[PDB]
C-alpha cells in the first residue's frame, strides 16, 4: 500500500509529466530482457530492461526516456507483489510468448490447465477432446508376458518325447523339424550344456569353447547362473554347395539360403510372425534378408537394424525378425542367406505366431505336450 | 518506442481529454470483434472493433465515442507488438474465453500448460494429478497378439490326429466335438479347400462355389492368397424338426437352437468367453441370442451389432460374441437360433477363453498337441 | 459503455484526485479476498476486497484510502464484463497463482492448454513433448486375458489323462507332481466337489464342511454357481517332523518348508514367475517367504502384503506371489514355511510363466494336452 495523492499544486507540472509518461508507458508492459546493471549505452525510448542488480532496487524497471525529452533519467517502477509480464524477443517452440509471472519472491513461468485426472486410481488419456480411463494392461510391459513357444522340442534338439518342463533330460541329440537344411546344408551337433557340469567344480560333462562364449554373451558369469542351468544341445549348420535362391546383402555380397522351416503354418495372426534365436558365425559371412521389402523390423541385441546387415564374425547376436504376410505360410521365413562353406553356430531358437517383445531371452519358451508331465 | 510528453501547455486541454478517454477505456481492453471496415452504423460508446482493413491502420481500434460527447470520432490505437486481448461474445465449450494474443505479426491463441513429459523415450499418463509412466504393452494393439485356440482340430473337421503345424493334411473329414447338433440338427461336410488347387491353374482338387464365395468375402482374390492357402473342411448344418428352447430375434420371428458346444469348460477367466466364426446362410433365416441379457457385445465384420439382428441371407459375416458368466460352463454358449430347415454354411470356427480382439481372421488359430510334431 | 468526459472545468479537482488514485491503484489489480460486507475495521491503503454483498453493489471493489489522505471513502469500481484478476495470498500446489476470471456472470478459473487430441478415435499420451497415439491393448485390463496354465492336471489331482475341457470327470484322486512333499510332509485327499451334488437338492455326492467354507469364501452362494460347477479334488498337506531349511516369519516364529515343486522349469520369461492358489489353515500356523529378498510383491485377496505375514487360521486367502529370478529354475519357489504338524488345506493351484494379473480366480486355468479332446 503506497500513495501519491495530495500533491501541493505548486509542483503540479512535474506530476502532470508523471501522469503523461507513465500512462504512455502503460500501453504494453513489455521488457526487452532482465539486466543486473543499467545499460550505459545503446538505449532509447521504448527500451525497458528489468534492473535486478544487487541492492534494494531489485526488479525495478529501467525505461530510458530521451526521445522528445528535456533530460533523460532512469525512471524506476518498484514492483510490489509483481504479476504476469509478457516477453517478446524470445518465445517457446510452440509459439508461446515467454511470461515471467512474479510470485512476489521469484520470477515464475506462466501456467494454465483445464483438465486434471480424478484421484480415483485410474489412468486417463485424451480421447476426442475428453479424458478416458485406461486399463491395467497399459502399465504392464511385454518382456514379462508369458506367451508360449510353437516348437515342440524347445530347440534342445532332443525330440518331442523329452519333457520341456524338466530341467534335466537324458535323451540324446535329435534333429528338429523346425530347421530343415537347404541348398544341401548339413546340420550337426555342436555342443551341449549339462546341469551340474564339472567345468565349474562339479562332476558332470565339461563345457566346450562355444558354450563359454555363449554364456559370456549371455552375461551368465556368476556361479548361481553359470555353474547351473537348463540343458540343451547346440548345432552347427554348414552351407551346402548348391547355388539356388540367390540374394545380396547390404554390402553387395551374394549369398544363398541355407536353411528352411519346412513350410510351417505360423503366418496366421494378422499374417504376423516373430522369430528369435541366438547365433554365432564360426566361418564365412552371412546377412539378413535381401533388402528392405514389405514391412520389416530387425532388432540386434535390442538395437534396431536394417536388412542386409552383415553380422560380425565370431560373436553371439540376438535377432528379432517380425514381419507380416497374409499368404498363410512360408518355407523360407528366416530369409537368412549365408556364403557357401560358412560354419554358423546357433542355439535355443524361439518362434512365435505373432509380434511379441520378450526381450533378450536366456532360454527357449516352454509349451505343453503329451510328454510335458 | 513513442511518447506524448512535453506538449505546449496552451493546448494541454486536448491531450488531457485524450488521456481521460483512454483511462476511461482502460477498465477492460475488450473488442466486440474484428472488422475489416469501420462500422458505419449501429455503434455507440462501449463498442470496440479491431479495424484490420487493408492499409497501414491494421489492428487499430475503432472505439466510437458519442454518448456524452461533443463530436464523435474513430479514435485510433496503433498497437506496437500487441499482446493478450480478451474476447467476450464467443467462448470455447469448456468455458475458456477467447483471447487472441497478438505475437507482433499474427493473432495467436492464448496458451497455458504446467506439465511436459520428460524427453527420455517414455510415455506418461495422468494419475491422481501426476503423470505416471506407461508400459510398452499400451502402445501395442490387440489384433497381433498371438493367443491360442481352444479347438484341438482347428475347426478343419479332420480330427485331433491331424497336425496343426502342417499346411497340408491328408486325413479325411471328421466331425468336431466342439459342435454338437441340437434339436435334431444334422451336420454334414460342405466342401474343402486344397493346396495347389486346380481351379487356379494347378492339378489339385477343384473348389466349389461356396469356396469362391468365401474367398471373395475374405478378400483373398490375388493368386498369392487365392491360389495358395491352408487346407480345411467346411460343413453345413441343417436345423432339425424339434422345437425345443424357443427364442425370438430382433424382428420378432421365433426360432430354435440348432447347435451346442457339449458343455465346454470355457467360462473360467473371469467368466469371460469369446467366439469367432465365419458363416453364411444358404436357406432360411437366423438371428443372434434371444434378447439383451447380462453383458453382451456383438461385432459384425468389425461393426458393433445388437442382439437379435437377422443376418443377411447368402453372405459371409464375421461374428465375435463376447460375454461374461461366472457359472463356469454352458452348453448353449453361442445362443444362436435358426429357423427349421435353414441351411447354414460355416467354416474356420475359433474359440477363446476370454476377451480377445484378433480382428477379422483368415485362418483358425493354432495350438499344440501330441500330433503337432 | 460509459464515460467520464462531460464535466465542467470547475469541479474536476476530484476527477484528478481519482486519476491519481485509480492509475496508481492499477499497478497490479489484486484483491486480498472476496467479502460480502465492507470490512469495518483493520483496513488501510493497499487493502482491496471484492465487495460481493447482496444487492446491486456486487463485485464492486472496496479499496480503503486513508493513508496520506484527508477523508477515507470506499471507492467503488463497478466491473462491466470483468476478466482475469490475479490473487496472491492463496495459490495452487503447483505454484499457479489463483486467478478468478469473471466471465460476466460468475467468477471462473483461469484456463490454458496447448494440445488437444485429434478427434479420430485414437488415444494419445505425451511422449518427449509430443502426443503419441496408443494401441488397443492399453484400454484392456489384465484380469480377462486368456493365458494358459502350466499345470497338466489343472490342480484337480485327477491325473493328466483326465480331460481338462470336460466339466465332469470320472477318474479317481491322483497326486500332482507340481506339489512334492518336503521335510517328510504327507499329502492326502481332502475332498471333492461333484457336478449336480445332492447337498443342494440333487442326487450326486454330498459336500463336506471344507467345500462349503471354500464356496462361501469364493462367494458362490447362489444356486446357479453353488449347486453347479466343475469337478475337482482337494488335498490336505501335513507338515513332517523334519526340521530342514529353517525360516522365520514376520512375527519371528521359526518354521520349515513343507512342500516343493520338484524344480520346475518356470523361470524363463525374464526370470519372472507367478503362483496363484487357494488355501486355508486347519491347524498350526504358517507364513510366506523368510524375509524381504530381491524383488517381491504379495497380494492377499487383491490386497498387497509383505513377506512373513502370518495368514489368519481357518480362512480362505487368495495369494499371488510374483518374483523375478534369472537362475532359470527353483525347487522351493513358493518359499512357504509351516509349523510342524500344521494341517494346511489347499485347492485349485495355478502357476504361470510370468507376471500375470488374472484377479481372484474361481477355477484353474485351462491348457491343451493329448487327453483334452
Amino acid at each position: 500500500g503506497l500513495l501519491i495523492n495530495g500533491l501541493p499544486g505548486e509542483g503540479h507540472y512535474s506530476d502532470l509529466i508523471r501522469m503523461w509518461r507513465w500512462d504512455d508507458f502503460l500501453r504494453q508492459p513489455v521488457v526487452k530482457g532482465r539486466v543486473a546493471t543499467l545499460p550505459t549505452t545503446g538505449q532509447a525510448e521504448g527500451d525497458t530492461y528489468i534492473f535486478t542488480g544487487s541492492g534494494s532496487n531489485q526488479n525495478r524497471l529501467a525505461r530510458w526516456w530521451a526521445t522528445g525529452a528535456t533530460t533523460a533519467i532512469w525512471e524506476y517502477m518498484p514492483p510490489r507483489l509483481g504479476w504476469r509480464v509478457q516477453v517478446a524477443n524470445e518465445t517457446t517452440p510452440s509459439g508461446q510468448v515467454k511470461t515471467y509471472e512474479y510470485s512476489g519472491t521469484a520470477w515464475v513461468e506462466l501456467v494454465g490447465g483445464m483438465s486434471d485426472a480424478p484421484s480415483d486410481g485410474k489412468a486417463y488419456a485424451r480421447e476426442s477432446g475428453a479424458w478416458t480411463e485406461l486399463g491395467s494392461a497399459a502399465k504392464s510391459a511385454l518382456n514379462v508376458l508369458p506367451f508360449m513357444n510353437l516348437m515342440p522340442d524347445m530347440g534342445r534338439f532332443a525330440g518331442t518325447a523329452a519333457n520341456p518342463l524338466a530341467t534335466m533330460f537324458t535323451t540324446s541329440w535329435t534333429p528338429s523339424s523346425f530347421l530343415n537344411g537347404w541348398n544341401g546344408a548339413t546340420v550337426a551337433d555342436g555342443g551341449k550344456f549339462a546341469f551340474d557340469n564339472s567345468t565349474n567344480g562339479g562332476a558332470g560333462p565339461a563345457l566346450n569353447a562355444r558354450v563359454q562364449a555363449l554364456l559370456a554373451a549371455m552375461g551368465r558369469t556368476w556361479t548361481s547362473v553359470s555353474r547351473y542351468g537348463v540343458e540343451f544341445f547346440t548345432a552347427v549348420l554348414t552351407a551346402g554347395s548348391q547355388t539356388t535362391t540367390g540374394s545380396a546383402g547390404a554390402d553387395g555380397v551374394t549369398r544363398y539360403l541355407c536353411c528352411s522351416n519346412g513350410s510351417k503354418t505360423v503366418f496366421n495372426a494378422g499374417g504376423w510372425a516373430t522369430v528369435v534365436m541366438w547365433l554365432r558365425v564360426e566361418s564365412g559371412s552371412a546377412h539378413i534378408s535381401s533388402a528392405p521389402y514389405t514391412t520389416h523390423r530387425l532388432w540386434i541385441n535390442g538395437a534396431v537394424a536394417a536388412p542386409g546387415v552383415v553380422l560380425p564374425a565370431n560373436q553371439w547376436v540376438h535377432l528379432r525378425f517380425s514381419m507380416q504376410s497374409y499368404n498363410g505360410y512360408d518355407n523360407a521365413c528366416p530369409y537368412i542367406y549365408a556364403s557357401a562353406g560358412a560354419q554358423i553356430a546357433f542355439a535355443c531358437p524361439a518362434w512365435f505366431g505373432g509380434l511379441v517383445d520378450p526381450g533378450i531371452h536366456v532360454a527357449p519358451i516352454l509349451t505343453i505336450n503329451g510328454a510335458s508331465a
Side-chain angles (χ1 to χ4, degrees), chain A:
Chain A
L2 62 86
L3 72 165
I4 55 175
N5 193 79
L7 65 94
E10 284 288 329
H12 81 74
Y13 182 75
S14 297
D15 307 288
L16 170 71
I17 305 294
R18 176 166 79 252
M19 269 80 77
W20 294 353
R21 186 157 81 256
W22 276 250
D23 189 358
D24 173 85
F25 182 76
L26 290 172
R27 77 185 67 72
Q28 285 305 329
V30 180
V31 304
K32 290 171 78 185
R34 180 179 174 175
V35 299
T37 177
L38 290 177
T40 53
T41 57
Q43 72 289 29
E45 180 60 37
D47 280 2
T48 317
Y49 294 80
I50 309 167
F51 177 77
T52 65
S54 307
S56 64
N57 313 68
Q58 292 296 111
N59 312 311
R60 296 210 167 203
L61 270 188
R63 161 58 66 85
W64 184 255
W65 162 46
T67 66
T70 310
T71 297
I73 193 66
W74 296 96
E75 54 179 315
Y76 293 163
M77 291 65 68
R80 182 170 43 72
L81 190 60
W83 291 107
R84 294 81 40 91
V85 297
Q86 47 262 23
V87 182
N89 298 120
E90 54 273 6
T91 193
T92 71
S94 46
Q96 306 178 179
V97 289
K98 185 171 75 70
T99 313
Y100 291 167
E101 67 97 13
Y102 192 72
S103 65
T105 306
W107 298 87
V108 177
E109 202 179 359
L110 76 164
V111 187
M114 192 291 300
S115 53
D116 289 330
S119 293
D120 52 336
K122 292 174 73 179
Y124 288 83
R126 197 70 161 162
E127 180 63 28
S128 300
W131 288 96
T132 294
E133 295 85 0
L134 294 174
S136 45
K139 314 306 310 310
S140 298
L142 278 182
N143 291 318
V144 184
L145 273 290
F147 303 150
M148 162 215 78
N149 199 356
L150 299 165
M151 320 207 188
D153 62 356
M154 301 325 88
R156 304 160 103 175
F157 302 156
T160 309
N163 187 341
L165 186 53
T167 315
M168 180 84 204
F169 71 86
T170 57
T171 54
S172 56
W173 186 69
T174 307
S176 186
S177 175
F178 276 56
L179 273 185
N180 302 121
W182 213 251
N183 274 318
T186 62
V187 190
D189 189 5
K192 184 250 195 176
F193 168 66
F195 186 93
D196 198 49
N197 62 90
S198 54
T199 290
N200 287 269
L207 313 177
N208 61 359
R210 186 185 304 93
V211 171
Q212 290 89 16
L214 191 142
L215 286 157
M218 298 303 100
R220 302 173 69 164
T221 58
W222 296 269
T223 316
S224 55
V225 66
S226 70
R227 190 267 182 280
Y228 305 102
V230 177
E231 294 206 333
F232 60 94
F233 278 93
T234 63
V236 181
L237 184 146
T238 293
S241 80
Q242 304 179 30
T243 52
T244 312
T245 316
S247 174
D251 59 346
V253 181
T254 308
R255 294 183 192 71
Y256 286 108
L257 190 73
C258 69
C259 59
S260 81
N261 64 56
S263 182
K264 297 278 177 298
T265 55
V266 301
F267 296 93
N268 186 9
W272 300 96
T274 294
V275 305
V276 191
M277 61 225 78
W278 272 102
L279 55 84
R280 170 181 193 257
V281 188
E282 316 185 326
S283 80
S285 53
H287 79 269
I288 297 90
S289 302
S290 187
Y293 299 124
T294 62
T295 183
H296 59 93
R297 47 195 182 286
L298 278 298
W299 294 277
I300 297 300
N301 301 321
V304 182
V309 66
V310 65
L311 75 174
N314 292 300
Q315 279 91 25
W316 289 103
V317 54
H318 187 273
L319 63 90
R320 263 176 284 201
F321 182 76
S322 296
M323 61 79 71
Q324 202 182 15
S325 164
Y326 275 14
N327 165 64
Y329 82 98
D330 194 290
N331 180 38
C333 178
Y335 298 136
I336 295 166
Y337 306 82
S339 57
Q343 300 330 306
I344 191 72
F346 41 86
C348 295
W351 292 356
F352 272 97
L355 177 57
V356 176
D357 186 74
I360 294 91
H361 76 286
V362 63
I365 288 294
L366 281 75
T367 198
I368 190 167
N369 61 356
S372 298

